Design an enzyme around this catalytic site. Structure first.
Site, PDB file in Angstrom:
ATOM      1  N   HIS A  69       0.846  -1.227   0.000  1.00 56.62           N
ATOM      2  CA  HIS A  69       0.000   0.000   0.000  1.00 56.62           C
ATOM      3  C   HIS A  69       0.873   1.267   0.000  1.00 56.62           C
ATOM      4  CE1 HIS A  69      -3.232  -2.928   1.282  1.00 56.62           C
ATOM      5  NE2 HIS A  69      -3.865  -2.224   0.345  1.00 56.62           N
ATOM      6  N   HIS A  73       1.778   1.671  -5.753  1.00 58.94           N
ATOM      7  CA  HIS A  73       0.357   1.230  -5.780  1.00 58.94           C
ATOM      8  C   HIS A  73      -0.522   2.408  -6.221  1.00 58.94           C
ATOM      9  CE1 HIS A  73      -3.419  -0.666  -4.730  1.00 58.94           C
ATOM     10  NE2 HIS A  73      -3.652   0.275  -3.809  1.00 58.94           N
ATOM     11  N   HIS A 107      -5.743   7.618  -2.873  1.00 59.51           N
ATOM     12  CA  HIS A 107      -6.765   6.713  -2.270  1.00 59.51           C
ATOM     13  C   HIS A 107      -6.222   5.923  -1.078  1.00 59.51           C
ATOM     14  CE1 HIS A 107      -5.072   3.252  -4.409  1.00 59.51           C
ATOM     15  NE2 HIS A 107      -5.745   2.508  -3.520  1.00 59.51           N
ATOM     16  N   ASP A 108      -4.907   5.733  -0.947  1.00 58.08           N
ATOM     17  CA  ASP A 108      -4.322   4.987   0.204  1.00 58.08           C
ATOM     18  C   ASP A 108      -3.343   5.872   0.992  1.00 58.08           C
ATOM     19  OD1 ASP A 108      -5.559   2.382   0.390  1.00 58.08           O
ATOM     20  OD2 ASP A 108      -4.257   1.674  -1.236  1.00 58.08           O
ATOM     21  N   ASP A 218      -8.130  -0.550  -8.006  1.00 58.06           N
ATOM     22  CA  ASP A 218      -7.475  -0.939  -6.730  1.00 58.06           C
ATOM     23  C   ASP A 218      -6.984  -2.394  -6.771  1.00 58.06           C
ATOM     24  OD1 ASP A 218      -6.557  -0.273  -4.291  1.00 58.06           O
ATOM     25  OD2 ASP A 218      -8.396  -0.692  -3.224  1.00 58.06           O
ATOM     26  N   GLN A 270      -5.587 -17.371  -3.398  1.00 56.37           N
ATOM     27  CA  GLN A 270      -5.701 -16.512  -4.595  1.00 56.37           C
ATOM     28  C   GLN A 270      -6.904 -17.026  -5.402  1.00 56.37           C
ATOM     29  OE1 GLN A 270      -4.048 -13.431  -5.565  1.00 56.37           O
ATOM     30  NE2 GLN A 270      -4.239 -13.745  -3.358  1.00 56.37           N
TER      31      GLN A 270
HETATM   32  C1  JU6 Z   1      -8.215  -9.576   0.117  1.00 57.43           C
HETATM   33  C2  JU6 Z   1      -7.302  -9.687  -1.070  1.00 57.43           C
HETATM   34  N1  JU6 Z   1      -7.072  -8.569  -1.735  1.00 57.43           N
HETATM   35  C3  JU6 Z   1      -6.242  -8.620  -2.827  1.00 57.43           C
HETATM   36  C4  JU6 Z   1      -6.011  -7.449  -3.581  1.00 57.43           C
HETATM   37  C5  JU6 Z   1      -5.187  -7.489  -4.674  1.00 57.43           C
HETATM   38  C6  JU6 Z   1      -4.582  -8.676  -5.063  1.00 57.43           C
HETATM   39  C7  JU6 Z   1      -4.794  -9.834  -4.362  1.00 57.43           C
HETATM   40  C8  JU6 Z   1      -5.634  -9.832  -3.231  1.00 57.43           C
HETATM   41  N2  JU6 Z   1      -5.846 -10.998  -2.539  1.00 57.43           N
HETATM   42  C9  JU6 Z   1      -6.676 -10.937  -1.504  1.00 57.43           C
HETATM   43  C10 JU6 Z   1      -6.727 -12.248  -0.831  1.00 57.43           C
HETATM   44  C11 JU6 Z   1      -5.623 -13.075  -0.549  1.00 57.43           C
HETATM   45  C12 JU6 Z   1      -6.129 -14.169   0.118  1.00 57.43           C
HETATM   46  N3  JU6 Z   1      -5.548 -15.285   0.631  1.00 57.43           N
HETATM   47  C13 JU6 Z   1      -6.355 -16.159   1.212  1.00 57.43           C
HETATM   48  N4  JU6 Z   1      -5.739 -17.268   1.713  1.00 57.43           N
HETATM   49  C14 JU6 Z   1      -4.286 -17.452   1.599  1.00 57.43           C
HETATM   50  C15 JU6 Z   1      -4.046 -18.822   2.221  1.00 57.43           C
HETATM   51  C16 JU6 Z   1      -5.270 -19.165   3.012  1.00 57.43           C
HETATM   52  F1  JU6 Z   1      -5.072 -18.759   4.353  1.00 57.43           F
HETATM   53  C17 JU6 Z   1      -6.403 -18.374   2.400  1.00 57.43           C
HETATM   54  C18 JU6 Z   1      -7.750 -15.968   1.325  1.00 57.43           C
HETATM   55  C19 JU6 Z   1      -8.357 -14.846   0.813  1.00 57.43           C
HETATM   56  N5  JU6 Z   1      -9.762 -14.748   0.884  1.00 57.43           N
HETATM   57  C20 JU6 Z   1     -10.587 -13.572   0.652  1.00 57.43           C
HETATM   58  C21 JU6 Z   1     -11.903 -13.841  -0.050  1.00 57.43           C
HETATM   59  C22 JU6 Z   1     -12.701 -12.548   0.021  1.00 57.43           C
HETATM   60  O1  JU6 Z   1     -13.021 -12.198   1.382  1.00 57.43           O
HETATM   61  C23 JU6 Z   1     -11.837 -11.887   2.128  1.00 57.43           C
HETATM   62  C24 JU6 Z   1     -10.837 -13.012   2.060  1.00 57.43           C
HETATM   63  N6  JU6 Z   1      -7.504 -13.947   0.217  1.00 57.43           N
HETATM   64  N7  JU6 Z   1      -7.874 -12.748  -0.352  1.00 57.43           N
HETATM   65 MG    MG Z   2      -7.256   1.259   0.695  1.00 58.35          MG
HETATM   66 ZN    ZN Z   3      -5.417   0.639  -2.760  1.00 56.54          ZN
END
Ligand code: JU6
Ligand code: MG
Ligand code: ZN
Length: 316
Positions: A69, A73, A107-108, A218, A270
């Site tokens: 952030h 970004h 924005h951040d 974003d 992901q």
């Molecule tokens: C929140 C974000 N924002 C990004 C913005 C830009 C690029 C990637 C981005 N990835 C993420 C991201 C990364 C991630 N890793 C997870 N894992 C990793 C290993 C196990 F523990 C689960 C689980 C989630 N579930 C999300 C689903 C939506 O509700 C909130 C949680 N997310 N979400």
């Molecule tokens: Mg933000």
């Molecule tokens: Zn941002």
């Protein structure tokens, strides 16, 4: 006086028009890239160059040295907004072009790498001031502060009422980057699209569409070429895992995405995030703004790369 035009090297001049453009590792080029994008998507008459440049350097200085952030970004999100505006030039006003690139840059502002959740659990003073969209309300308040520094009013040639309108464009754009708000906003837009009630002459509908463009900008690292997307994922998790560390110090179990012990599940995480958040986002945005198609296609390409990683065909 518009005789001083901003120019980019040949490769940047061509590639800055593509949605998947990466602004590169030379941070002393990012202000020039931003000014170039303002001059082309707004006009050279939109801002006095000396105020804009002074504004840009104050914004840069109030971004922190955090893994994701950060200043890079801000410019990156601003570039995604440039590419959306350049491919949809008929649909937006002069005030909106003006305000949306600035909203993306700001924005951040002053992000310390912690979620609204962590501020609430930590009982951070900002949490008492703003109960919802805590960080986003701080980002906007930081934007107002900077706009109010001497020689920084980049909107000086606007009337009182136009100034107020653009600050309202900016405020709603920055608030819309709170991902917690995105789920409701996208469902509403989807309903309105598929009923055929959506109307871009309706200000509350514009607000929703701009909100969605903000989310899409974003998250735009999921729309880069795979090597960029994969490397950027390391920066995002470096912040998530530091926040999870901080949750554990408060004696609170962090949600799985912020726990560094669940490192091996990043590919499944992901995949989770692409299906639940990213794909729906770029789908709804392409429905409303067909020319934003390359964002969805590049997202689909990266989703396919994460699946490839899950099945052992690629390493991470
Ligand atoms: C929140 C974000 N924002 C990004 C913005 C830009 C690029 C990637 C981005 N990835 C993420 C991201 C990364 C991630 N890793 C997870 N894992 C990793 C290993 C196990 F523990 C689960 C689980 C989630 N579930 C999300 C689903 C939506 O509700 C909130 C949680 N997310 N979400
Ligand atoms: Mg933000
Ligand atoms: Zn941002």
């Amino acid at each position: 006086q518009g005789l001083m035009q901003f120019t980019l090297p040949v490769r940047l001049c061509k590639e800055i028009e593509l949605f998947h453009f990466d602004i590169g590792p030379f941070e002393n080029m990012w202000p020039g890239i931003f000014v170039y994008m303002v001059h082309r998507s707004c006009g050279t008459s939109c801002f006095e160059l000396e105020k804009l440049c002074r504004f840009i350097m104050s914004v840069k200085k109030n971004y922190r040295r955090v893994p994701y952030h950060n200043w890079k970004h801000a410019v990156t999100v601003a570039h995604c907004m440039y590419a959306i505006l350049q491919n949809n030039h008929t649909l937006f006003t002069d005030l909106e072009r003006k305000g949306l690139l600035i909203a993306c840059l700001c924005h951040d502002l002053d992000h310390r790498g912690f979620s609204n959740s962590y501020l609430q659990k930590f009982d951070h003073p900002l949490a008492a001031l703003y109960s919802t969209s805590t960080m986003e309300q701080h980002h906007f308040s930081q934007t107002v502060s900077i706009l109010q520094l001497e020689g920084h009013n980049i909107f000086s040639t606007l009337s009182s009422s136009e100034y107020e309108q653009v600050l309202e464009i900016i405020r709603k754009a920055i608030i819309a980057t709170d991902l917690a708000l995105y789920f409701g906003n996208r469902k509403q837009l989807e309903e309105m699209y598929q009923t055929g009630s959506l109307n871009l002459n309706n200000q509350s509908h514009r607000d929703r569409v701009i909100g969605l463009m903000m989310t899409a900008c974003d998250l735009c690292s999921v729309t880069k070429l795979w090597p960029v997307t994969k490397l950027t994922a390391n920066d995002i998790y470096a912040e998530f895992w530091a926040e999870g560390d901080e949750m554990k110090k408060l004696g609170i179990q962090p949600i799985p995405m912020m726990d560094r012990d669940k490192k091996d599940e990043v590919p499944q995480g992901q995949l989770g995030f692409y299906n639940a958040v990213a794909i729906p986002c770029y789908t709804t945005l392409t429905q409303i703004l067909p020319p934003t198609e390359p964002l969805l296609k590049a997202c689909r390409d990266n989703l396919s790369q994460w699946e490839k990683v899950i099945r052992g065909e690629e390493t991470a």
